[model samples]
Target: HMKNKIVFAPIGQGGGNIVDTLLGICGDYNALFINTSKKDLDSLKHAKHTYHIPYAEGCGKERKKAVGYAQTYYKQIIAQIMEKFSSCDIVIFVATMAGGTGSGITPPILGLAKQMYPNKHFGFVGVLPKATEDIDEHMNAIACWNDIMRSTNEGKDISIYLLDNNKREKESDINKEFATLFNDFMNMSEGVVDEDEISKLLTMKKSNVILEFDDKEDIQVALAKSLKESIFAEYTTNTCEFMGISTTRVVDVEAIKSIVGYPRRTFKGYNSKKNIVVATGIEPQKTTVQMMNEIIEDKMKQR
Candidate 1:
């Protein structure tokens, strides 16, 4: 039986993790596994659409080789998807732009997919490494994002959302550190599954209103403001902490600007304190806990 939901095609290492974690939480919704290496292909036995194709194998230390390798594998995978799952209603392409594999492959795969299925809707979810990452990874991510954006603007039917993992990852040493990183990726998929959760949290509605910020008094408020029907209704009052690293601050603002209607950044003075506190709410309870596992890591430069 055909399910009336989105199908994901995990492109590379980071992207594969996203699809896998999403499946772990939401069960198998359909996934196309595209990895040419035997070792990589072996990991996809349980994937919804696993296929093995031969592509060059080497460490891509330079941008040219990275892009070329990605393109080779992408062509193989696109051919398969066109022959096999072209009829899918929606296709979610998940990956991190930092790597050679997904970064190179995504643009061409997306371009061809849109050409093949002109009427179908496509959504791309990518993890942008925080401005601070390996030089190669960061450069690759920037190049990949530019190519994808250019393709989309050229009349290709697609939507792209980027999750900056650097913003979410903290510097720390704990067994749960890796788990927390994984959780951030999973949250992106979860956010995709039930966008209403974020939508409502960001936009305070009458029945779903949970909390609000009162900037006039410099306090967290609980009453809902008059609901406005807008994409930004979820973010009524925006307050930003001056992320100490000036470079990170610039990257964060740029990331926000990439979107159509995010609030403009107004930098307040920097706060030297390295502190992290997590706050969450249930229908009846709200709690704040100091995350002792990780601290903010050094700011790495991404494109």
Candidate 2:
């Protein structure tokens, strides 16, 4: 396997929980967690390094308070990045975008990471709340979503992977899905797919997705299902610049090409028993953003 300097930084309690699954998969990865709550940081089992953001007790679902804390302790938070991400070529922040700590802290710290390490890839593994989730979560989502969108447009090396919670029955299932698919997505580089190809898909800034489907019926059916359903939020397939597909047996690329249209570049590795497709350089889902917007509009009125 080609070695790449990669690190996963979880920003808050939800992030800590998600990275717990992420760390369980990637044995050698650098696990770092930063939070405003000390108890939440203590709840973690896989973090190699932990830093508690100073001058705040806890934000819970309150985003502005968390934002204030992040600004007050900006340099202290940056110091943690200095220690953890200094040697890493790629840094992906893992967190649920529905709550305060991770939602608020992410934007400012990423603001610094963009300036401090201008050349490295800074990716985000963001999880969205389910439709049935409460109002506070959605209120926080409004701000968090816009901030992420702003960065994606302005930040030079930004790659955001948005995962929808509506896709799974439970939160832990979504976390595990993110862990396995993301790990396999990177591991594909070792064999059938080339390292440079996989790395370019990540390093060259754009939206990306890693989805896995069971080895079942017709290949086209499987591919179509994957295109429609996955842990990832819905995306436009045709907007992609490159695609790297990993499957169990050799399959015709024409089958998929017909569905997604002709992407500029493609890589196939029939090494896995399941159909796992990694798509990069596409736009993140706008439907999820509209969902969050509707939440705000609903609550803005008096019941």
Candidate 3:
């Protein structure tokens, strides 16, 4: 069983946009927008808590500068965060990895929070930049990714979901896509899985989900197709645990177990039409390790 009062903390402009869209759709969740730019904070609506750092201009894409701001004003920031989310069981940081403020401050803020309250579960929703963006954007993303990987490796008990901006069908509608997915995930039926299991799956390390719809009458076939089309298909790892939601309650649990391999536990939920499949428990691959190495190497070179 889980005692869950989840809070969403958006770090910067990109993070703020994602959270803002979520607020428009679902006003029930608690959110706090933290940024170095007051203009960005002012543009948002429906966010219950908004905090702007002392220098409210912007980070100007400089990650180190953003870190400096966080370090200098950490007490104020930490106080505000605790006041809002102290009672919550989970804290999920939403940010765009390419930006300075979000990418930079997320690590330190989360680190400090974990230091203060080591028992709380932490999660991240990171938005990756489009491939066409400037080199600096890519570098910032790499740096932030590395930092997140380091935290997870050091046993911080964090979960991460990385959404690539370039993978979206419509670049301009990226915000809407994220908002819709999250809203659907959050509002799904919880009878079988319950909020505690859902929260556990979400806080698991390297968590990601793939949603698909099929008109096929056979639930087995539909589940198979959805698994084949998942983002986890490309990455190799043992199936740890997963939760599935389908329009039909006639799903084949055996088939799900076979496809997922060594699944210790699973949860299923029923809904109106669309089937939502979420999977996790895959160990980081060699490519991921190499990317982390490159990010660290680049940071050292820059220094």
Candidate 4:
């Protein structure tokens, strides 16, 4: 099976919310829901061309087993893709960078994706939490980010756009804002290829174009630019504390603080410390890694 254009694949849970959104945005693309629940699948029965892989008994007993089930389910979807659909022009994997089904499943799928379709394109769209949250989700976000980063460094072309749900909440209704913004984000991804942006990017023929950072300073520059263009309206530095802010649910805060230390620092003249400036964003449905890299860079320039 082969096609000249991309096959949009969204493998994750959260009812049919993301899948439905993708279909609405892409119009003519293909979508497969890898871990949708039985109830959700039933809800989508009226929807055409959507696929689901049911959860088996005893699949949620242990963490490792649960993770394996998601992988197997995803692989099954790939098999069907091979049989029914033509070869994908690209695979777009969407997930919140923490918790439940998506995070655990996406990593192994990406790893296998590179090996299975070595010449094809694959990118991830992930959401991360703010610095304050339940320790478990925060930890899981880090794990997922690392997993994606590993795949990225191993030479798979991937682009990730994330939201610090906490910061977004500060400007608008947390729940409503996330839904709108996330939907917009999905539309943007679909538009990139469906509208022809990928042709220009691919024409560049640069394998690691999105992964272009040679040093920590270079990373800082990119982070600053990304935040300026993607997330924030405007930001100014109060001071630097070398702060490393992360996101989690409230229940996980203490556990994460124990692992990464307190979230405060004292500056010379002010009550805050002046090492790295850290800012966090959060939303009701999810939390994600804040744009700390930009915060640090702004503080350095101010000093």
Candidate 5:
């Protein structure tokens, strides 16, 4: 597999938290932390690369303020991205939509990235707001979702790593699982899959779903358990365009194919201690639509 340059541009407090975990575990992989509040920026333990907009004095759940701040520093932020991630093949923006800063800043930065690096692969790991939060958080998430949706729809190719906060798990657990899988995927060595195939699998312009199984007695049974434990948004494997698998022990990729049919292109790599499968071109509408409908349901209840 071709060695690819990857960087995480984490845009808000939640983003910072998630990326901080990644950097801590993965040992200082390229990451740039940007925030509207200096206090939030200063709190991070991992990233030495920090950008502070400083004008918002904390957005206070008002995404409008963060949007203005992002636009205000758009040029500088673009320059910062260029300086730090010039050779990076993949740049992923990490953030939670329920917050002010991440929700507001991510889309514009993503747009800037699109224009600046037309050939670069972009991914957004957006955390969906929990359904039980205050109405304003839901509003922020809905607005943020639409902004990215419209941007992606406009042919600015990007990948979505959607995580559902509504799932039955803690925030840290989800973050750690995602970080571990990301580290594993990026560090894969030469495997049964060749270079071009691996490249195609990595560059799909859709949502990415990553699953891990503890080497089980039966591959199908372990797969069932892993599927039940996923914290990411819902997606079907048969609809994907690409899949890359890695395992500590010998696991037949054909067994996986028996269940999900076959993605157009598939690659299998060797792992030291994990059974991981990654697929892209999966749709994110299911969870996003639920977020939309929940907002509408709340609005109609008072009538």
Candidate 6:
């Protein structure tokens, strides 16, 4: 069981939006909204606490400026976090990776939080840029993605879930998709496995989730559909360390293991049509490591 509670802190515009959507669907969780823009902070209604960085008008799509602001006020930010969520055992940072504030600010905030609270767990929910976005957006997304990957590779006590914006069928559906996915995890419960186990799965080194809804009566077909819908399925690595499966209906443990190709903790829900699969301890893909190395090489060359 977890020793302390969980805190969901969304930083900047994109993060705030998702958190806002989450609160509407599930209003009981603890959440804090942090942003450089006063207007953005003011627009949010459901957060338990809110913090506005001093002298931060906005990042204006400039990642360097966002980085500077995060560095300058990290102490203040940490102080606020401690005061607001002193008993939290885990903090999950939510952000969209294409824009300036969320992209540039999240990594530093995550780093400082770990340094300040060495005993607590940290997790990230990063929203990737749409494929049709311009070059600048792509560059910022790559930079932010690389930063988080590098930190994880260095053995940080963190887990990350990256959601590709391009995968959404419609832009308006993002809020619903995120809300449903998170709610499923939060509400997951059954025999043997419990909330703490789910939390452990989420806080593992590198975690990802897949949520799918299908009407197939066959558990095998349902499992296959869910796996096909999972974003992590696109990756080429087989290094899964811990896995948990939660479904709206019952499933045979042996059958799950047979198809999952590994052992997993299980949770069964009531709806019968929704299935949620969560896994962690995945080895970062070769391309991901290569990109981080290239980023390091570029920095070294510049220096």
Per-residue C-alpha lDDT of model 2 across residues 16-119, encoded as one tens digit per residue: 88887878877667767888888888877787688887756678678788887778777766667767567877888887888898888887678677777777
Candidate 1, number of clashes: 8
Instruction: Give the alpha-carbon lDDT of every model.
Output: 0.44, 0.75, 0.70, 0.43, 0.76, 0.69
**Candidate 6: minimum summed lDDT over ten consecutive residues — where?**
263-272
Assess candidate 3 and give its lDDT.
0.70
TM-score, structure 3 vs. true? 0.83
Give the worst 10-residue stretch by lDDT in candidate 5.
188-197
Runs in model 2 deviating more than 4 A are 1-4, 154-157, 260-262
TM-score of each: 0.54, 0.92, 0.83, 0.54, 0.90, 0.84
lDDT of 4 at 6: 42
RMSD for each model, in Å, please? 13.9, 2.1, 4.1, 15.6, 2.5, 4.5
Q: Where does candidate 5 stray beyond 4 Å?
A: 1-4, 154-156, 190-199, 258-261, 286-288, 299-303
Q: Write the per-residue lDDT of candidate 5 for residues 123-215, one digit (tens) a residue.
A: 889888766777778778877887887777732388878887776458888778778877666655435545565566666787877787777
On residues 60-88, what C-alpha lDDT tens digit does candidate 4 reach at each position?
21224547556556566666654555555
Report how far residue 238 has shifted in candidate 1, in Å: 9.8
lDDT of 4 at 148: 68
List, residue by residue over 66-154, the lDDT tens digit for candidate 1: 45656556556767765576566666677666776677777778877777677666767666554445555666766676676677662
Better by lDDT, candidate 5 or 2: 5
Evaluation by lDDT, superior candidate among 1 and 3: 3
Q: For candidate 3, which ten residues in a row score worst on lDDT?
A: 226-235
Residue 117's C-alpha lDDT in candidate 4?
73
Off by over 4 Å in 4: 1-4, 14-16, 44-47, 57-65, 71-74, 154-156, 170-198, 202-303
Q: After superposition, how far is residue 31 of candidate 3 from its true place, in Å?
A: 0.8
Clashing pairs in 5: none
